[PDB]
């Protein structure tokens, strides 16, 4: 149920992004962040993993001027909470 409280964008680069979320009180073993072109199938967004203690992450390799989807999912044992997502353009 939108496990990270709120999300913000902080970076300002042509090829990358830097995202910041906030620390939910629930047990989170890890976070997964997905970045893909908006309107895409979403089965090619190249996921990457972030520790549950951390609240920030850097994305790389993006094409400038494309609409990219950034989604944060937090995982428990045997479960995954509902994600919260934002979209940004370079």
């Amino acid at each position: 149920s939108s496990v990270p409280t709120k999300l913000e964008v902080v970076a300002a680069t042509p090829t990358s992004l830097l995202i910041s979320w906030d620390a939910p009180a629930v047990t989170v073993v890890h976070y997964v962040i997905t970045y893909g072109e908006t309107g895409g199938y979403s089965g090619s967004f190249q996921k990457f993993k972030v520790p549950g203690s951390k609240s920030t992450a850097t994305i790389s390799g993006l094409k400038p001027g494309v609409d990219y989807t950034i989604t944060v999912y937090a995982y428990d044992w045997d479960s995954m909470y509902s994600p919260i997502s934002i979209n940004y353009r370079t």
């Binding site: 073993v29 890890h30 199938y41 996921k47 520790p51 995982y75 045997d78 909470y81």
Partner: protein, 210 residues
Amino acid sequence: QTGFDLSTATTLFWRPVPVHVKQQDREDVLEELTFRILTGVAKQNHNLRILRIHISSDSDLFFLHTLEVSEEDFQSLKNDQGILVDFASFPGKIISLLEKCILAQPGDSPRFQAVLTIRGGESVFKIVEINDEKQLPHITLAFRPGNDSVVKQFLAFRLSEVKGTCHDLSDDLSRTRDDRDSMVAQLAQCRQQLAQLREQYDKHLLEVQA
């Protein structure tokens, strides 16, 4: 070689949902089943798009029902099967329906429920609106029960998953231990300075007192 590419697949829903399972034994029961919804691409071609759903049990690790659909064969199930959606938003709406199944009390006017009927070799999963004697299938899907091979592959995938999560936890544990050692050292430093300052203050007080 293998059709679907789980390595770079995206997990959109992974949560236990209340499901009614019906079998020919007639032992109708409500069990909490874990649904994992994955959007990915085939390893043969980056243009072939697949959606796969896994119904498993954390209680029974040998219970698995699988669904795999491409973008092309999606036309067969777009018509004749459920609400009108494109291949892209079908995951979103199915996820909304499953979530409605989770937060479903009898007093809910649209009491959405989920039922999995397993008959021999095939199983059909349907989410149904069940108020005032109506049974309305919002979504009807067909699931393949797990053979030993596919359940074996699923178990291996989850084992590698858990291994990676636990290695990450070990890294975090070493880091937190280092942070705590640094904090206790800083605590000792502070207390030492506080004792020194209390000494100087008491010496100053005794000097003024004389």
